[PDB]
Amino acid sequence: DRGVSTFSPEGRLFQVEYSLEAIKLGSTAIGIATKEGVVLGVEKRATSPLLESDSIEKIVEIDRHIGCAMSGLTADARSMIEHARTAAVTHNLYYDEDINVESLTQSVCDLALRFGEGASGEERLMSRPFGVALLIAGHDADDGYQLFHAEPSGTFYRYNAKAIGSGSEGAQAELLNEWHSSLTLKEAELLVLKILKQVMEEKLDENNAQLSCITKQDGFKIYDNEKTAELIKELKEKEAAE
């Protein structure tokens, strides 16, 4: 066939390039870094009513001060998630403190290229890139709140807000207009949740979507269905004004 590390004729990595496909195949996941906090929300995307959306978490807590969400082939992240969480603990284990969200984030993206078959120059044992992308939200003393988009490319950026997964780009465009630094956690909740409901195939609810935040005071905090439902209903009220 063709090698896994094989560069595109443009110098790109097919598998990596293709890895980006399943990324878009991942549920649309969105978060907004505010000064107040970072709102997270994601697409439950239950494939069946018998499927209990409770057992669907693409939002995960790395640590109190740092957590992240996934969009892509999920269980790939488990290692990464387990990996990531370790590092902070490890960091804290060494440094008796929280890790810079970036420092953690940066560390994680180092997992990216570690796929290869007996790769030249190192031993990095994995067959393929990770099939998932990550919204990563953490509050750190230095950078306050931040939102980074982890990528199987090992590249990540800071984001005022970010939309990843299926309906990302459109939702992304939405974020472009909607976002401003002065957004409030609640607003961001509303914005995400709305733009979710926007991009969501199913009618948005607490069951077919999932919410959470990370707040310097409280660090990473999940939103339950009920608070969710309110915000939902709240939007429904606010969404219907004019």
Added chain:
Amino acid sequence: NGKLSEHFLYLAKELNLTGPKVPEDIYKSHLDNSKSVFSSAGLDSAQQNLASSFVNGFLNLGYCNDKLIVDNDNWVYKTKGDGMTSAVASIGSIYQWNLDGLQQLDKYLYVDEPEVKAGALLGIGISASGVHDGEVEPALLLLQDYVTNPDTKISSAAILGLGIAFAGSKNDEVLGLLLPIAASTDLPIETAAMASLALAHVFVGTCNGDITTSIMDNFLERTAIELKTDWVRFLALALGILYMGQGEQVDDVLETISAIEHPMTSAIEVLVGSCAYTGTGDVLLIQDLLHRLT
């Protein structure tokens, strides 16, 4: 219109059905279900408004869009000539199959001109066209009042109106009106030329010994202006519609008619088709009319 009795019937009910009224406004249900689009535009110009006023009648034939005609009248007035009439008959086209469609028509039924007069004349024959008495109130029959004149465009579309009026409304009067006008035999004035054809549209499918004799009394006589193949034909095909009813006629009629050759002639070759209502699906279409092409 029958009765309520279970043999004749034609209740007070079928009146909206058998003669269609409401179903079309009903069809206008599914007609709006699956639909087409509105091409009408007030355009720039009477040359352009000529057709465009027709279109409200075109598109909305059998339909009430008449607001664009009702509320814009001069759209039909800027149409002038027999497009005046056209834009008026388009209103009757809009008002076809109405309880009363005289409304805009009687307005245009006369303004300044026979052509204008001609408008409703045709259009009112259109009001009840497809039936006789309209859908309720009298309009097609009243038209027979407006027909009366041996002048160009008045007769013209009244001839039109009363041809389509008197299909199923058939009357000797219009003949007895047009027959001497036919004897008067002037297309640009008496208009009787095309009248015979409207007269052909009156008694259709029936033996009228009068018209049997009447055009026998005109055509043979070659009344008034006739030199042209016009008053030849106009009268020729006039007889070809009204009868054409018989077992030996479907093939016997053409035997004596399209055999020779004149105005009244090459046309009626297929008029034996639109003749008898008994024994449809006839082949003589190509069967016979291969020959005259060969």
Added chain:
Amino acid sequence: DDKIVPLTEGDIQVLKSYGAAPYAAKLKQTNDLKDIEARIKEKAGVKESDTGLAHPLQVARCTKIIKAKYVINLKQIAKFVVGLGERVSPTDIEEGMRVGVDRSKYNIELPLPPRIDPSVTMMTVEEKPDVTYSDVGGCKDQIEKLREVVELPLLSPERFATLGIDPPKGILLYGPPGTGKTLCARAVANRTDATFIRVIGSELVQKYVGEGARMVRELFEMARTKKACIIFFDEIDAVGGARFDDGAGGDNEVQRTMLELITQLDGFDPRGNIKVMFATNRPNTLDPALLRPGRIDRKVEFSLPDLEGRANIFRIHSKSMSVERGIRWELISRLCPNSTGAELRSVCTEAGMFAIRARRKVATEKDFLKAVDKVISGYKK
């Protein structure tokens, strides 16, 4: 039986009428002169050959005039060349009515072309294709360049000369073949009314040798005849691409058939006027000599954009169908991944049966959702 036979009775007499009729004007008109004029007229023309016992033409037999015979036979009887010095005949060299060189040229002109070609063009060309905007739906980015490659130079050749240039002289198309692909070529072909040569490489390799070579010439010949013409190849993969199968040794001519195509297209062919266009599945298969500039310049996918392109494309397609105006093509387009401006009909076109299964005029969302599912699942490819 009886009553039906009355209809049957009417059948007989009716037919007898025409029979009786047809005989009538038959007597009147009494057909030599439609031809016997033209016949005897062209009998002169006939005889105009028949002296000296005599647009492909193949062979002129203009025969046996010795003083003189003024003809070419390219044929196993008495092969002939009029030339060797200044050798003509005032209008026409001589006879057959055939007057001229056969095909194979001997001197010039001579009698204006008697020519040209045997096997017609075994290749066949539709000019002003049935596609102008037809599959042009969703196809923009490609055509955006195509128009440059094709349309504008056909439109205003001057600009490129005003610049000092030409259009891209050759262009590649790949992805699902001909899918709108050829038609899209046919599109701008009929958009510009240039001569669109659809020649498939399938036509090129046949039972014999110099096969497409012969063709490619005749192609390149009538290219210049049809100038401002689109030479279009679907299946560049038919002749194949770059290969060493000359190492096997049988492929050589097939390989050469390309090299044929390769060679001649290179030097003299105007590609600002005569358009050259290629369609494949695999651009990876190219003989680089194809990919050479001044042979292939522009290179383009067919292609398969985004959610958005599809919607329009969907929106484009479904206008054929009676379609529910509430449901959004955006809705549908969200679901499907990127796929072909052909396949996107499976979106619409399949739903018609959905629409008929659901017995709708206007297919519902799920009707397409299912179709999206149904079709895409039904792929498993």
